[PDB]
């Protein structure tokens, strides 16, 4: 459990 | 310079009641109407002894994304007898059932499925059959000014892991706009 | 070329007279045969490895292979 | 040097700016010129008309030829 | 010299990756090739002699994202020019039947060794991913599994960060069981069960070890030396896997038996008459490997790492790995 | 769901004319392109790259307004700013200085 | 009813009386002396120009904007032509018809032939206006005219070929620049325009000299060939390296910026754009940070992944530091990053969280006291000026250019304060002591008596002033000044403070100011945003520094983690400037590498270190703002302050008799973008 919000954010930067 | 007459002796003898506005350019005569009479004003043309129009030449769909009635359909339609055509315009909006021709000019079939996928007018009567340009099962409708031009979902290839998928659009070398505009 | 005759194997002007372009010999065209610059012909081999074929600057198969960023890293010593 | 570079790929033989280069100018005789080549279609370069009221040459901004006035 | 992703997923998308795909022409290359390039990565396959055999990994991918090269292997300088640039090396090479100038040793070993050797030269890799199989130290029969076994020892001690993964036996659109099998029912009397009928095994789902490759490709600094084993889903014996065939193909099974005598005095001819002037006929189903490998269970050693560690397992061996059997 | 931006754009800053000025247009800020590798052109993945400032153009901010809220997605609109217009005269330009100090 | 040409708002000074004309049929209403162009653009209907500028002064020059007035001969120019209560204007007669035509013939007769290789060919008024109104044909054969090309510095090349004799250039050069360098010299069709001596032009606006000359002949150096207009797209944004918060338009083409270029905004720059600003792209696109690093103990870096880099920087966090945690926030950084910096800096627990410029000193917080109240439009309207130590040139040129207006305008005495500089407007000197500040706060220096025989007189402390030791003193003598010269009537509120950042507005308003002074020295886990931390050299040997930044060119060199971050024209933040007006910028291009925007970089370092913001997007961070300071998401119109400065000295001695030091130095090399960018490091060696 991370925080979806983290999740897109180890990802790239358009979410 | 083409048809005064046929308009004219239209317009003096219509029931004036389901005329909404008329324009005798050069370009083309218009009788814009409302969309609750079209079909009686179309099934008074083709059976008038001298307005006899006998011939439905298109039905095309124009968009307008600026005002409250967002589409604009149109008969363009000629009289093979009297050497005239007349140009029918009616105003639509989304989701509002617009009646049908196909009872008078059997010849409408395929316009109204045509505006019925490229745009998103309906059809109350029989017409409004299922899709006939766009291929099968479309998101949007590809002719108004908000389906983009190279479409949502349109990638479409070939996969050895199943067979063939479609999958969305990543294409390369974007489409390029050029502005061109002229401020006097 | 009796065995492996292929088009594009005509110069340029030939080619010209041969496709009725132009009614001027092969020898005339030659005569002007623009100086100071030029490439000597070499048929469409595109079949022949790819280096007798060729590549874009940005193909792993060009010597060249360019690379298209339009910035630059930091890149500390 | 890094135009060339960015373009050409052989590095062979010479490039564009090499040869227009070794073109030496052309010592015109009056003060205004007009530069196309010989014929004024089918060879473009519009008309260029230069001035020549400096002691180096003077490029053309299509095919620099590089003019010169010839006297004082 | 880590690499960056530029894109958004999808065909189009650099995300860095450049893989040489050595065997990339078969099965489990067509899959894994498809992966990396469908994920986006440039991809160079090499062939050894065709003009059209890599023809179809062509398309699946971008412009000059697949990039067939060159003659592949007996030569130093060409296999170092295939490896020019990359970023990751996938060795998938290796028959299932030995042919008069290659052996078993020569091919699967050496050249193991070479593309160690070639790879410690071109010293600027990331990931050496080679894929042997299912089978362990020479502790078996079948001189390939112990020729791969000094393979994957070879390329562990050659290059400590790569990555062994040991798959099962594999079924797909085209494997080299269930096609020979239908095959053989459908031309004349039916299947025969090898050494006893009721042999171990754990078949598995070939897109799903796809994804286990790309998975442990990827793997962000998680193991970058590992060698462990991919199992299937679930424990099948020969008869059950045959009975599952011959359910979905919709035919009355039939098997043949008295399996180890015939099974060894019918496939030993075929190496002596091999190494003694010119090619000589395909194992369909008399293949000594087979023989050993089925006269031996192997299965899982639960030992070291599996699907579970890295992802899960495949889907199941029922419903779509095998509905392409509906061509018959 | 996207976040949009309706605004009019302001006369460019090269020419003088005024036949692109008061026109209300709504753009997706929609940036997310890359160099493809082969060549260098640029490529992109949004099916919205461009149409909102290649079609989409609009006759008044209500119209713009009332447009995205139907379509749904949510927006944020911007000010339009106008040219003050002072009063001008040559004979300011040609004023007098005073006497001298 | 009909509208003016873009909405133009009329004054109507004396709104009892305004003549009316007819205006092609219809009438229209007028100010007392508005001119025939400006009627005819209220009427609705534009009038071909060159060489009139709304902003310059007015010259029948060109010849084009000719119309016919009914009660009069037979041509007249639109332009300085004063209406009249009821003359017939006429625009579109055969008369002005073949006026406009003839006048095109004879321009593009003497022109040269050179569009596809010249620049703004596609922009060009004279092209459009040609196209427009001109003829289709031309009739001559003879040979043309040309001159010789110049040069005017690394910013404005000019191909003199096509100087078509408008003075739009030299009005602006004399009028709004201030150097009177650039003239029209020659006679007949010799007539050239150039510095005499080969000169360059050591001022700023230049820029502004390329945008105001429509022919393409002065155009920008670094911008010379590399595209047309039609083929890259324009998004609207502010600026962020001066203070002043200029509105600009980037225009951009693929991931690349290729321009930027003023936008009208009659409220803080009219067209303008200061001279560094237009050219602070080039290094923005040249060097570049794209990767998070992490210093490897051979003093190296190596590019790791951001989970990694998180996780080590909050382990440490948690780690050592009890109470020795303290954030820099950048110079060129938006109120979402600095609140969200904040939150997490007091939810780690230890707080010493301080803005980029912001003195270490108590810099209480009123914001009438730390923005500048008369709105800079209002600037227009003093009439004696009060600069102490600012020299407003250097820093905010707009606010300079709009005070040199006003000078011009309607002579304005002014005092300034502080070092030696050079001005461009008459200026008084008068000295360079907060002693001289008290004397005038007090009796002597009879230039109080100016104030005190003033009417709108205007008081301009600049921003540097708050580093500054006693700075509670400078802002009381101030005070004294104010209640004994009447300059804070309620009418008018003309007490200003400039300001030389573009984070500062944002980062005063939420309060970042440094609980105590040796911050850096007893610190021991510093997370930086913006550079230069007094030469980067406080921080001690062993102390965790975090460079959460872009571009990074200073202090990186100190740094122990880096992150790389987005630029000023990659996000969508909210810059404050100085007149308190909220201003947002919106992205053009895409980011670089694998970098992130400020906020999301705090908050997920905020999760993986534990305690994490309630907040995760940029609504509810907003919504935060509004909870701590509302204008800032009350953004796009300024909020006064209608509170007095009633603060509370402390020094109550006197004012540490040491001169002004000069704030700002190089204007160019300031503001690491430009820094490690190019364009301005050129203009540094040369112009200057
Ligand atoms: N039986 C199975 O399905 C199974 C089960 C577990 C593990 N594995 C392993 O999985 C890997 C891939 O198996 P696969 O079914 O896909 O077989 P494969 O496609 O035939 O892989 C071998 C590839 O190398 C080529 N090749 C053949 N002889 C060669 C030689 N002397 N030198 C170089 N290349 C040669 C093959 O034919 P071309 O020359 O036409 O390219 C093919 O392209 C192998 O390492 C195998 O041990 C297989
Ligand atoms: S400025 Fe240049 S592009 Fe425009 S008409 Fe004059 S010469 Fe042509
Ligand atoms: S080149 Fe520029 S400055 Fe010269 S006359 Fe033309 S518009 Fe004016
Ligand atoms: S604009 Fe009136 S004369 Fe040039
Ligand atoms: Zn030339």
Redesign the interface.
């Given at each position: 459990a991370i925080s979806p919000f983290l999740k897109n954010f180890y990802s790239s930067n358009y979410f | 310079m083409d048809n005064q007459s046929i308009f004219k002796y239209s317009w003096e003898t219509l029931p004036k009641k389901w005329v909404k506005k008329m324009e005798r350019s050069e370009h083309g005569n218009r009788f814009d109407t409302k969309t609750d009479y079209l079909f009686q004003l179309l099934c008074f043309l083709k059976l008038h002894t001298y307005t006899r129009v006998q011939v439905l030449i298109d039905i095309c769909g124009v968009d307008y994304?600026?005002?409250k009635r967002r589409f604009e359909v149109v008969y363009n339609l000629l009289s093979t007898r009297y050497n005239s055509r007349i140009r029918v315009q009616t105003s639509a909006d989304e989701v509002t059932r617009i009646s049908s021709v196909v009872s008078l000019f059997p010849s409408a079939g395929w316009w109204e499925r045509e505006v019925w996928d490229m745009f998103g007018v309906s059809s109350i009567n029989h017409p409004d059959l299922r899709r006939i340009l766009t291929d099968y099962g479309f998101e949007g409708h590809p002719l108004r000014?908000?389906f983009?031009?190279?479409?949502?979902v349109e990638?479409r290839?070939?996969?050895?892991?199943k067979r063939v998928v479609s999958?969305?659009?990543?294409?390369?070398?974007?489409?390029?706009?050029?502005?061109?505009?002229?401020?006097? | 070329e009796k065995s492996r005759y292929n088009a594009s194997q005509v110069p340029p002007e030939w080619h010209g007279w041969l496709h009725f372009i132009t009614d001027h010999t092969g020898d005339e065209l030659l005569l002007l045969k623009p100086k100071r610059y030029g490439v000597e012909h070499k048929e469409n081999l595109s079949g022949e490895g790819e280096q007798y074929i060729y590549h874009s600057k940005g193909h792993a198969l060009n010597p060249g292979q360019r690379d298209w960023t339009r910035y630059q890293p930091w890149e500390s010593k | 040097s890094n135009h060339t570079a960015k373009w050409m790929q052989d590095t062979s033989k010479k490039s564009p700016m090499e040869l227009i280069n070794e073109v030496p100018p052309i010592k015109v005789e009056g003060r205004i010129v007009a530069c196309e080549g010989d014929t004024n279609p089918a060879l473009g370069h519009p008309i260029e008309f230069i001035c020549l009221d400096l002691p180096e040459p003077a490029v053309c901004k299509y095919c620099g030829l590089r003019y010169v006035q010839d006297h004082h | 010299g880590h690499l960056v992703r530029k894109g958004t997923g999808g065909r189009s998308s650099v995300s860095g990756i450049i893989a040489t795909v050595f065997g990339a022409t078969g099965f489990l290359g067509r899959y894994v090739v498809q992966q990396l390039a469908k994920m986006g990565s440039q991809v160079l396959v090499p062939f050894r002699g065709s003009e059209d055999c890599p023809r179809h990994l062509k398309l699946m991918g971008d412009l000059g994202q697949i990039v067939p090269m060159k003659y592949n292997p007996r030569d130093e300088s060409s296999v170092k020019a295939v490896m020019a640039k990359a970023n990751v090396v996938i060795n998938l090479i290796g028959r299932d039947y030995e042919t008069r100038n290659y052996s078993f040793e020569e091919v699967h070993y050496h050249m193991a060794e070479n593309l160690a050797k070639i790879s410690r030269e071109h010293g600027g890799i990331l990931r050496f991913i080679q894929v042997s199989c299912l089978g362990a130290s020479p502790s078996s029969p079948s001189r390939m599994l112990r020729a791969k076994a000094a393979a994957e020892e070879v390329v562990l001690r050659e290059l400590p960060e790569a990555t062994i993964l040991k798959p099962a036996v594999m079924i797909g659109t085209e494997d080299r069981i269930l096609n020979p099998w239908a095959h053989f029912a459908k031309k004349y009397g039916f299947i025969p069960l090898f050494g006893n009928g009721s042999t171990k095994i754990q078949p598995v789902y070939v897109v799903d070890v796809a994804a286990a490759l790309t998975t442990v490709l990827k793997d962000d600094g998680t193991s970058m030396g590992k060698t462990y084993e991919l199992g299937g889903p679930e424990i099948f014996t020969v008869h059950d896997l045959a009975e599952l065939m011959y359910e979905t193909i919709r035919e009355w099974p039939r098997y043949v038996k008295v399996p180890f005598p015939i099974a060894k005095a019918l496939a030993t001819p075929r190496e002596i008459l091999l190494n003694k002037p010119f090619p000589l006929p395909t194992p369909e189903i008399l293949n000594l490997d087979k023989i050993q490998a089925l006269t031996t269970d192997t299965i899982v050693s639960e030992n070291a790492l599996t699907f579970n560690d890295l992802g899960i397992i495949p889907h199941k061996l029922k419903g779509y790995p095998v509905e392409f059997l509906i061509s018959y | 769901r996207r976040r949009v931006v309706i605004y009019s754009p302001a006369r460019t800053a090269s020419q003088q004319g005024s036949g692109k000025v008061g026109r209300w247009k709504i753009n997706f800020l929609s940036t997310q392109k890359w160099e493809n590798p082969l060549m260098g052109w640029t490529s992109t993945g949004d099916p919205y790259a461009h149409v909102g400032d290649s079609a989409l153009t609009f006759d008044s901010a209500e119209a713009a307004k009332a447009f995205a809220e139907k379509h749904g997605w949510e927006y944020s609109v911007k000010k339009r700013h106008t040219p003050l217009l002072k009063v001008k005269s040559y004979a300011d330009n040609f004023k007098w200085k005073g006497f001298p100090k | 009813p009909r509208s003016p040409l873009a909405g133009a708002r009329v004054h109507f000074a004396n709104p009892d009386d305004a003549i009316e004309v007819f205006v092609d049929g219809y009438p229209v209403k007028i100010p007392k002396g508005m001119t025939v162009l400006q009627a005819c653009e209220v009427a609705g209907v534009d009038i071909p120009r060159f060489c009139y500028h709304s902003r310059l002064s007015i010259a029948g020059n060109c010849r084009m904007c000719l119309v016919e007035v009914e009660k009069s001969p037979k041509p007249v120019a639109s332009c300085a032509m004063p209406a009249l209560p009821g003359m017939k204007i006429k625009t579109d007669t055969p008369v002005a018809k073949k006026a406009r035509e003839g006048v095109m013939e004879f321009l593009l007769m003497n022109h040269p032939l050179d569009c596809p290789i010249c620049d703004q060919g596609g922009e060009c008024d004279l092209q459009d206006q040609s196209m427009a109104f001109g003829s289709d044909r031309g009739r001559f054969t003879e040979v043309k005219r040309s001159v010789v090309d110049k040069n005017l510095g690394p910013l404005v090349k000019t191909v003199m070929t096509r100087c078509i004799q408008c003075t739009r250039c030299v009005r602006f050069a004399t009028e709004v620049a201030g150097v009177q360098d650039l003239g029209m010299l020659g006679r007949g069709s010799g007539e050239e325009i150039g510095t005499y001596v080969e000169k360059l032009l050591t001022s700023e606006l230049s820029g502004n000299v390329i945008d105001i000359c429509p022919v393409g002949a002065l155009t920008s150096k670094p911008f010379a060939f590399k595209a047309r207009n039609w083929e890259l797209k324009g998004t609207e944004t502010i600026d962020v390296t001066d203070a002043v918060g200029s509105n600009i338009r980037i225009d951009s083409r693929g991931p690349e910026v290729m321009r930027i270029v003023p936008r009208l905004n009659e409220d803080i720059n009219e067209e303008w754009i200061s001279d560094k600003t237009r050219f602070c792209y080039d290094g923005l696109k040249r060097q570049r940070l794209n990767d998070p690093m992490i210093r490897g103990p051979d003093g190296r870096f190596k590019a790791v992944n951001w989970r990694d880099a998180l996780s080590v920087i909050a382990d440490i966090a948690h780690q050592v530091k009890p109470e020795e945690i303290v954030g820099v926030a950048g110079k060129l950084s938006d109120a979402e990053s600095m609140i969200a910096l904040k939150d997490f800096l007091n939810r780690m627990g230890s707080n010493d969280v301080w803005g980029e410029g912001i003195g270490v000193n108590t810099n209480a917080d009123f914001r009438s006291g730390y923005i500048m109240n008369t709105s800079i439009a209002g600037l227009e309207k003093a009439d004696v000026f009060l600069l102490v130590g600012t020299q407003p040139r250097v820093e905010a040129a707009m606010v300079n250019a709009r005070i040199r207006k006003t000078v011009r305008s309607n002579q304005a005495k002014v005092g300034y304060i502080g070092p030696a500089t050079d001005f461009n407007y008459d200026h008084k000197h008068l000295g360079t002591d907060p002693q001289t500040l008290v004397e005038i706060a007090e009796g002597r220096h009879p230039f109080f008596k100016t104030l005190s025989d003033a009417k709108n007189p205007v008081i301009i402390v600049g921003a540097g002033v708050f580093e500054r030791k006693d700075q509670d003193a400078i802002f009381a003598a101030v005070e004294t000044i104010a209640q004994k010269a009447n300059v804070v009537r309620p009418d008018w509120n003309g007490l200003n403070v400039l300001l030389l950042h573009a984070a500062q507005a944002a980062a005063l308003d939420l309060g970042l100011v440094p609980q105590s002074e040796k911050s850096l020295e007893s610190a021991k886990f510093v997370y930086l945003m913006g550079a230069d931390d007094v030469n980067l050299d406080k921080i001690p040997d062993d102390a965790f520094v975090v460079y959460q930044g872009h571009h990074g060119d200073k202090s990186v060199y100190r740094a122990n983690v880096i992150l790389p971050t987005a630029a000023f024209s990659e996000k969508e933040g909210t810059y404050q400037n100085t007149e308190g007006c909220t201003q947002q910028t919106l992205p053009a291009v895409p980011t670089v590498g694998d970098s992130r925007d400020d906020w999301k970089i705090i908050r997920a370092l905020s999760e993986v270190a534990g305690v994490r913001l309630p907040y995760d997007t940029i609504g509810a961070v907003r919504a935060r703002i509004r909870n701590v300071a509302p204008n800032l998401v009350n953004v796009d119109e300024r909020e006064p302050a209608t509170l007095p400065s009633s603060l509370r000295p402390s020094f109550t001695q006197k004012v540490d008799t040491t001169p002004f030091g000069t704030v700002i130095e190089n204007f160019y090399m300031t503001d690491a973008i430009t820094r490690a960018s190019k364009i301005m490091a050129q203009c540094s060696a040369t112009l200057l």
């Amino acid at each position: 459990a991370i925080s979806p919000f983290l999740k897109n954010f180890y990802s790239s930067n358009y979410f | 310079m083409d048809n005064q007459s046929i308009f004219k002796y239209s317009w003096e003898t219509l029931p004036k009641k389901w005329v909404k506005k008329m324009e005798r350019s050069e370009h083309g005569n218009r009788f814009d109407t409302k969309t609750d009479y079209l079909f009686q004003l179309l099934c008074f043309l083709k059976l008038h002894t001298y307005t006899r129009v006998q011939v439905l030449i298109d039905i095309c769909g124009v968009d307008y994304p600026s005002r409250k009635r967002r589409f604009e359909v149109v008969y363009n339609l000629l009289s093979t007898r009297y050497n005239s055509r007349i140009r029918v315009q009616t105003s639509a909006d989304e989701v509002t059932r617009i009646s049908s021709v196909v009872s008078l000019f059997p010849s409408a079939g395929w316009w109204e499925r045509e505006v019925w996928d490229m745009f998103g007018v309906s059809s109350i009567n029989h017409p409004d059959l299922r899709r006939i340009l766009t291929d099968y099962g479309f998101e949007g409708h590809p002719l108004r000014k908000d389906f983009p031009l190279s479409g949502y979902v349109e990638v479409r290839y070939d996969d050895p892991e199943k067979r063939v998928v479609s999958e969305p659009i990543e294409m390369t070398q974007e489409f390029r706009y050029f502005d061109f505009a002229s401020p006097w | 070329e009796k065995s492996r005759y292929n088009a594009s194997q005509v110069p340029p002007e030939w080619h010209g007279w041969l496709h009725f372009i132009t009614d001027h010999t092969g020898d005339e065209l030659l005569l002007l045969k623009p100086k100071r610059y030029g490439v000597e012909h070499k048929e469409n081999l595109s079949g022949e490895g790819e280096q007798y074929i060729y590549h874009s600057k940005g193909h792993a198969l060009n010597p060249g292979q360019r690379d298209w960023t339009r910035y630059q890293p930091w890149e500390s010593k | 040097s890094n135009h060339t570079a960015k373009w050409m790929q052989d590095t062979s033989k010479k490039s564009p700016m090499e040869l227009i280069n070794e073109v030496p100018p052309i010592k015109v005789e009056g003060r205004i010129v007009a530069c196309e080549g010989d014929t004024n279609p089918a060879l473009g370069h519009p008309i260029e008309f230069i001035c020549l009221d400096l002691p180096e040459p003077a490029v053309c901004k299509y095919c620099g030829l590089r003019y010169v006035q010839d006297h004082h | 010299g880590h690499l960056v992703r530029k894109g958004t997923g999808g065909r189009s998308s650099v995300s860095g990756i450049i893989a040489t795909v050595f065997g990339a022409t078969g099965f489990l290359g067509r899959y894994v090739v498809q992966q990396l390039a469908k994920m986006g990565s440039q991809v160079l396959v090499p062939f050894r002699g065709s003009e059209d055999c890599p023809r179809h990994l062509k398309l699946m991918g971008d412009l000059g994202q697949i990039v067939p090269m060159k003659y592949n292997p007996r030569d130093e300088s060409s296999v170092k020019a295939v490896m020019a640039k990359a970023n990751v090396v996938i060795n998938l090479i290796g028959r299932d039947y030995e042919t008069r100038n290659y052996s078993f040793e020569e091919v699967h070993y050496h050249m193991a060794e070479n593309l160690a050797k070639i790879s410690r030269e071109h010293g600027g890799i990331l990931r050496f991913i080679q894929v042997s199989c299912l089978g362990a130290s020479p502790s078996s029969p079948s001189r390939m599994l112990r020729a791969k076994a000094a393979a994957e020892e070879v390329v562990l001690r050659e290059l400590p960060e790569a990555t062994i993964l040991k798959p099962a036996v594999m079924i797909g659109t085209e494997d080299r069981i269930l096609n020979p099998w239908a095959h053989f029912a459908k031309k004349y009397g039916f299947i025969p069960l090898f050494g006893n009928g009721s042999t171990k095994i754990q078949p598995v789902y070939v897109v799903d070890v796809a994804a286990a490759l790309t998975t442990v490709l990827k793997d962000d600094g998680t193991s970058m030396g590992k060698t462990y084993e991919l199992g299937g889903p679930e424990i099948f014996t020969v008869h059950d896997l045959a009975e599952l065939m011959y359910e979905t193909i919709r035919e009355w099974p039939r098997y043949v038996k008295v399996p180890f005598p015939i099974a060894k005095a019918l496939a030993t001819p075929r190496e002596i008459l091999l190494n003694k002037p010119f090619p000589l006929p395909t194992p369909e189903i008399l293949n000594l490997d087979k023989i050993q490998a089925l006269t031996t269970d192997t299965i899982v050693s639960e030992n070291a790492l599996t699907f579970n560690d890295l992802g899960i397992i495949p889907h199941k061996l029922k419903g779509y790995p095998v509905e392409f059997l509906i061509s018959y | 769901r996207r976040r949009v931006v309706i605004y009019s754009p302001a006369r460019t800053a090269s020419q003088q004319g005024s036949g692109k000025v008061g026109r209300w247009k709504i753009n997706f800020l929609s940036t997310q392109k890359w160099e493809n590798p082969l060549m260098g052109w640029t490529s992109t993945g949004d099916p919205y790259a461009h149409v909102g400032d290649s079609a989409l153009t609009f006759d008044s901010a209500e119209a713009a307004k009332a447009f995205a809220e139907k379509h749904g997605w949510e927006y944020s609109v911007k000010k339009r700013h106008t040219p003050l217009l002072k009063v001008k005269s040559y004979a300011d330009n040609f004023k007098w200085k005073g006497f001298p100090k | 009813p009909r509208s003016p040409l873009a909405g133009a708002r009329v004054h109507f000074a004396n709104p009892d009386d305004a003549i009316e004309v007819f205006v092609d049929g219809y009438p229209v209403k007028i100010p007392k002396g508005m001119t025939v162009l400006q009627a005819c653009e209220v009427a609705g209907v534009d009038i071909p120009r060159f060489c009139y500028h709304s902003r310059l002064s007015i010259a029948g020059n060109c010849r084009m904007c000719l119309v016919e007035v009914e009660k009069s001969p037979k041509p007249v120019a639109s332009c300085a032509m004063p209406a009249l209560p009821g003359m017939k204007i006429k625009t579109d007669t055969p008369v002005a018809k073949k006026a406009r035509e003839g006048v095109m013939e004879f321009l593009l007769m003497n022109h040269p032939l050179d569009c596809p290789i010249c620049d703004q060919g596609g922009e060009c008024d004279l092209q459009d206006q040609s196209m427009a109104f001109g003829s289709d044909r031309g009739r001559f054969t003879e040979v043309k005219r040309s001159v010789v090309d110049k040069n005017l510095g690394p910013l404005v090349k000019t191909v003199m070929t096509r100087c078509i004799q408008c003075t739009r250039c030299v009005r602006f050069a004399t009028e709004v620049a201030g150097v009177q360098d650039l003239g029209m010299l020659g006679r007949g069709s010799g007539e050239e325009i150039g510095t005499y001596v080969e000169k360059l032009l050591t001022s700023e606006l230049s820029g502004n000299v390329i945008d105001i000359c429509p022919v393409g002949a002065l155009t920008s150096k670094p911008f010379a060939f590399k595209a047309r207009n039609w083929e890259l797209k324009g998004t609207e944004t502010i600026d962020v390296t001066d203070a002043v918060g200029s509105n600009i338009r980037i225009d951009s083409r693929g991931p690349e910026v290729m321009r930027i270029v003023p936008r009208l905004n009659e409220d803080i720059n009219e067209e303008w754009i200061s001279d560094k600003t237009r050219f602070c792209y080039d290094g923005l696109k040249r060097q570049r940070l794209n990767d998070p690093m992490i210093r490897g103990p051979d003093g190296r870096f190596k590019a790791v992944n951001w989970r990694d880099a998180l996780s080590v920087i909050a382990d440490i966090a948690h780690q050592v530091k009890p109470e020795e945690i303290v954030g820099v926030a950048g110079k060129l950084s938006d109120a979402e990053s600095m609140i969200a910096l904040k939150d997490f800096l007091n939810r780690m627990g230890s707080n010493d969280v301080w803005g980029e410029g912001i003195g270490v000193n108590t810099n209480a917080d009123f914001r009438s006291g730390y923005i500048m109240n008369t709105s800079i439009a209002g600037l227009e309207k003093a009439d004696v000026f009060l600069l102490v130590g600012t020299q407003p040139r250097v820093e905010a040129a707009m606010v300079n250019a709009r005070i040199r207006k006003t000078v011009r305008s309607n002579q304005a005495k002014v005092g300034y304060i502080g070092p030696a500089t050079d001005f461009n407007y008459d200026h008084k000197h008068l000295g360079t002591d907060p002693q001289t500040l008290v004397e005038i706060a007090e009796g002597r220096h009879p230039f109080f008596k100016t104030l005190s025989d003033a009417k709108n007189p205007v008081i301009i402390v600049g921003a540097g002033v708050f580093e500054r030791k006693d700075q509670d003193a400078i802002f009381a003598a101030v005070e004294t000044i104010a209640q004994k010269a009447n300059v804070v009537r309620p009418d008018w509120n003309g007490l200003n403070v400039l300001l030389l950042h573009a984070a500062q507005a944002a980062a005063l308003d939420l309060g970042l100011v440094p609980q105590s002074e040796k911050s850096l020295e007893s610190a021991k886990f510093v997370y930086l945003m913006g550079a230069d931390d007094v030469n980067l050299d406080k921080i001690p040997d062993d102390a965790f520094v975090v460079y959460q930044g872009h571009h990074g060119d200073k202090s990186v060199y100190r740094a122990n983690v880096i992150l790389p971050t987005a630029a000023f024209s990659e996000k969508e933040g909210t810059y404050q400037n100085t007149e308190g007006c909220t201003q947002q910028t919106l992205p053009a291009v895409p980011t670089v590498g694998d970098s992130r925007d400020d906020w999301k970089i705090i908050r997920a370092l905020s999760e993986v270190a534990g305690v994490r913001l309630p907040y995760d997007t940029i609504g509810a961070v907003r919504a935060r703002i509004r909870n701590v300071a509302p204008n800032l998401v009350n953004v796009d119109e300024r909020e006064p302050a209608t509170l007095p400065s009633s603060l509370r000295p402390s020094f109550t001695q006197k004012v540490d008799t040491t001169p002004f030091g000069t704030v700002i130095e190089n204007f160019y090399m300031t503001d690491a973008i430009t820094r490690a960018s190019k364009i301005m490091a050129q203009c540094s060696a040369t112009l200057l």
